[PDB]
Design a protein around this ligand. Structure first.
Ligand SMILES: COC1=C(OC)C(=O)C(C/C=C(\C)CC/C=C(\C)CC/C=C(\C)CC/C=C(/C)CC/C=C(\C)CC/C=C(\C)CC/C=C(\C)CC/C=C(/C)CCC=C(C)C)=C(C)C1=O
Ligand SMILES: CCCCCCCCCCCCCCCCCC(=O)OC[C@H](COP(=O)(O)OCCN)OC(=O)CCCCCCCCCCCCCCCCC
Ligand SMILES: CCCCCCCCCCCCCCCCCC(=O)OC[C@H](COP(=O)(O)OCCN)OC(=O)CCCCCCCCCCCCCCCCC
Lengths: 79, 142, 96, 91, 67, 317
């Protein structure tokens, strides 16, 4: 601890340096948002969503995507 | 040989409107006319060849032209204002023009009855049952 | 502020990607329709270029399969105007 | 092409100036310590080259992986640097 | 006093705004009053090209619902 | 037109480049209790043009030196500087290089050749040492210079300098990332061999190794290059970290604001020069391989995690 103190006052870059190294190694693990990154990026519609053959027993979005069934991004909205 | 289809076989009315025009009405077109398109997509995917879905493509085009004829007939002015402002921007970004968008969107809801699709609800995969025969042995697998 | 701004910016990005998602069907048809035209048009000239050549099948898939192999850029614009070919070839690398 | 046009004007403007300059007025080190630093440079430059792709990796659905991978890259190289210090190599 | 360093600066400033205003009006003149389309990705070049074909030869000319 | 847009964006910068030396020889003056050059012309406005004409007229001494390389280095220097101004994202940038920042980084690196080759070509001991010292400091400051940008980009989403105008529509990137601004500013001071970091031509310590033998026209071209750079790097600070206001309707405001911030930060390195003695060679490199590089590496991580744990990944447009 004592060195820590002087280190805070002498060579006070490394201290800050390491501190950040850690804080970046922690915040991700604990964050009400970490999960969103893999979703928000997953959702972005870069590639065309090829349709599916409506063979039968389909709970998928019913034709017009304006139909209720299907995934929603209201989580993205009002985020 | 190559069995490339003939021109008369591939001549059909053209949309030909500035890309900007489309981007402004993109959302609504994704709304009023995705029935045929999705089916066409299904054909063009499972049946790899393009020759095997040409006719569907013709239907694809026919659906939009009238989409435009409706808008031309009703709320043309709004749409005209919205596209002109949208076109000026270099990436034709949607947010620079929201005041013009609101009047265009509200009117066609009022007259055409259509609706601007909420954020999303166009990206979601669709089910369209193309009565065409789900093909097999594609790529002449042999 | 940066967190909120990029989250908004992301919402705008999903909005316009979906805008093309909706419009590509109209373009896909257009592309194919035009693509075939270029192939066919080249067929006409093809049926007029090597006619004299002996043992000259007007045209034949370089391959054996009858599967639809998309047309390379060269094939589409090779016979066509040089500029046309150049445009396609070096027309993106060179900005608008 | 547009860039090519600009650049050749850029060289032309310079070459014009040097020429004017010449035509108008007619009237053994032992950097061993450095050597080491130079090598580290090479190495660090290469890492940076492996860190350049991040701007697109940030988009990876596998965000977590990207984090772990990236974090490791920086950390490992950081360790290399520290060693230099620990072994007093650079000093 | 220090009043005098300003003359020189004025001629620097004026010579650093020209470029930014110039490049940003020789674009809106050549592109028909509409900002030069920035085609970062092909889609955009496609849309741009599509525009060319749609009318005249230049993409800046833009046909509308009345076509 | 495009040609006209090449005159503008070049001449204007060259004329401004000339007026920087003047505003350097007067701002340093008033800080040191002296008027500076006001007697030639009105208030010294004709002073930059005057020595340019003297420099070109005086004999270009060719020491008894590898001629080709000796003459090429100046050419490269100016070529690179003028070139680096092509993709700058003042509104509607001359050329939307999609990976512009990379381009800037690339050309900036090539400049090192000039100093290195110049020293080798000069064939004088002073010059040789100057080159060696220069290459080392230059490249090293490049290593933190590049990492500092990579941290920025990851919060911008792309390498294109045009994106930052949309990233900085609500707040400057100084507020966030100020710790790197400082480290970008100090690195911008090293890469333009300006004062605090000017061991390349210390004059007192070693006598102008870079151009020991260079005089007249060659002296001028690098010379011009350095000062144009002095501006360019300051301008990159004024786009990447201090984001000027921008309005699509009125694109001029950006240029005007860009002007004000560029001139003030250009004024700052003038002010730094008069105010500080010069760092030693060893001290200089220590600061970067020791005082900064560890700072720059760590924050890179923080800027990798920041977006994720804040779900603040930027759009790729
Ligand atoms: C402390 O005293 C000193 C100064 O004056 C205060 C200096 O500023 C400086 C800085 C450099 C100088 C010796 C003088 C500054 C040089 C100039 C007046 C301009 C140099 C001329 C050129 C390379 C080209 C000028 C011409 C053009 C740009 C034409 C463009 C069209 C030093 C090092 C110095 O010793
Ligand atoms: C938590 C999330 C993550 C974020 C964490 C943030 C934590 C708080 C920020 C911590 C770091 C803040 C400062 C960053 C830059 C300074 C980095 C540094 O450590 O300085 C090195 C060096 C001083 O080192 P020295 O005095 O030799 O002693 C070393 C002791 N280890 O510095 C120098 O010697 C510099 C010498 C400069 C000479 C010219 C000075 C010019 C001064 C005026 C301009 C200043 C910059 C203006 C920038 C404008 C905008 C770009
Ligand atoms: C002297 C050496 C330094 C010369 C100046 C610095 C040149 C730096 C060139 C970097 C590479 C070019 C680049 O990054 O962008 C070129 C750009 C394509 O980039 P992108 O944004 O993807 O555009 C496509 C989508 N619109 O659009 C282009 O591809 C334009 C065509 C390529 C131009 C490359 C640079 C040409 C340089 C010409 C002079 C070369 C002199 C060589 C001297 C040595 C002896 C040969």
């Amino acid at each position: 601890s004592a060195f820590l103190k002087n280190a805070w006052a002498k060579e006070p870059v490394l201290v800050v340096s390491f501190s950040v190294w850690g804080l970046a190694i922690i915040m991700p693990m604990i964050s009400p948002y970490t999960k969103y990154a893999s979703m928000i990026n997953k959702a972005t519609p870069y590639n065309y969503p090829v349709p599916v053959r409506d063979d039968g027993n389909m709970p998928d979005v019913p034709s017009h995507p304006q139909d209720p069934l299907g995934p929603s991004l209201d989580w993205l909205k009002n985020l | 040989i190559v069995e490339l289809p003939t021109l008369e076989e591939l001549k059909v009315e053209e949309v030909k409107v500035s890309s900007a025009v489309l981007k402004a009405a993109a959302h609504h077109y994704g709304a009023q006319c995705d029935k045929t398109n999705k089916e066409f997509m299904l054909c063009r995917w499972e049946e790899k060849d393009p020759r095997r879905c040409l006719k569907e493509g013709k239907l694809v085009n026919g659906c939009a032209l009238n989409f435009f004829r409706q808008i031309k007939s009703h709320c043309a002015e709004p749409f005209t204002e919205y596209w002109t402002c949208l076109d000026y921007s270099n990436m034709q970004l949607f947010r620079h023009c929201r005041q013009q968008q609101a009047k265009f969107d509200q009117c066609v809801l009022d007259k055409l009855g259509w609706v601007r699709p909420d954020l999303g609800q166009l990206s979601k995969v669709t089910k369209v049952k193309t009565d065409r025969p789900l093909p097999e042995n594609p790529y002449h697998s042999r | 502020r940066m967190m909120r701004w990029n989250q908004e910016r992301r919402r705008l990005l999903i909005e316009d990607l979906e805008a093309r998602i909706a419009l590509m069907p109209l373009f896909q048809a257009e592309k194919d329709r035009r693509t075939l035209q270029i192939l066919r048009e080249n067929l006409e000239e093809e049926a007029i270029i090597m006619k004299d050549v002996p043992n000259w099948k007007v045209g034949e898939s370089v391959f054996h399969t009858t599967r639809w192999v998309p047309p390379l850029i060269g094939e589409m614009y090779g016979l066509r105007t040089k500029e046309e070919m150049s445009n396609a070839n070096f027309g993106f690398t060179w900005y608008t | 092409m547009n860039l090519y046009t600009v650049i050749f004007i850029n060289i032309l403007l310079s070459l014009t100036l040097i020429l004017v300059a010449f035509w108008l007025p007619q009237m053994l080190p032992f950097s061993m310590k450095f050597f080491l630093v130079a090598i580290t440079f090479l190495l660090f430059d290469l890492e940076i080259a492996l860190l350049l792709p991040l701007p697109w990796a940030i988009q990876t659905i596998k965000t977590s992986t990207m984090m772990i991978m990236a974090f490791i890259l920086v950390t490992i190289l950081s360790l290399g640097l520290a060693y230099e210090w620990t072994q007093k190599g650079l000093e | 006093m220090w009043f005098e360093i300003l003359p020189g600066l004025a001629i620097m400033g004026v010579c650093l705004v020209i470029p930014g205003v110039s490049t940003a009006y020789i674009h809106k003149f050549t592109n028909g009053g509409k900002e030069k389309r920035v085609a970062r990705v092909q889609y955009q070049w496609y849309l741009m090209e599509r525009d060319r074909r749609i009318s005249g030869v230049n993409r800046y000319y833009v046909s509308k619902g009345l076509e | 037109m495009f040609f006209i847009n090449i005159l503008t964006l070049l001449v204007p910068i060259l004329i401004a480049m000339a007026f920087l030396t003047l505003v350097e020889r007067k701002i340093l003056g008033y800080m040191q209790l002296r008027k500076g050059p006001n007697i030639v012309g009105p208030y010294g406005i004709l002073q930059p043009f005057a020595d340019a004409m003297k420099l070109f007229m005086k004999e270009p001494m060719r020491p008894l030196t590898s001629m080709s390389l000796f003459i090429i280095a100046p050419t490269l220097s100016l070529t690179l500087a003028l070139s680096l101004w092509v993709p700058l994202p003042m509104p509607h940038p001359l050329i939307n290089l999609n990976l512009g920042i990379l381009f800037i980084l690339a050309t900036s690196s090539l400049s090192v050749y000039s100093i290195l080759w110049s020293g080798w070509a000069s064939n004088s001991k002073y010059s040789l040492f100057g080159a060696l010292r220069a290459v080392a400091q230059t490249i090293s400051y490049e290593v933190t210079m590049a990492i500092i940008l990579l941290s920025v980009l990851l919060m911008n989403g792309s390498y294109s300098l045009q994106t930052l105008i949309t990233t900085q529509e609500h707040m400057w990137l100084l507020l966030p990332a100020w710790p790197m601004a400082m480290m970008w500013f100090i690195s911008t001071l090293a890469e333009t061999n300006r004062a605090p970091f000017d061991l390349t031509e210390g004059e007192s310590e070693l006598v102008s190794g870079f151009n020991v033998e260079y005089a007249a026209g060659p002296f001028a071209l690098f010379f011009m290059a350095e000062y144009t750079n002095i501006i360019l790097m300051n301008a990159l600070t004024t786009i990447i970290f201090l984001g000027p206001l921008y309005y699509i309707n009125l694109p001029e405001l950006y240029s005007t604001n860009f002007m004000m911030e560029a001139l003030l930060l250009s004024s700052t390195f003038l002010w730094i020069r008069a105010s500080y003695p010069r760092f030693r060679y060893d001290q200089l490199m220590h600061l970067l391989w020791k005082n900064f590089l560890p700072l720059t590496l760590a924050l890179c991580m923080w800027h990798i995690s920041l977006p994720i744990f804040t779900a603040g990944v930027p759009p790729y447009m």
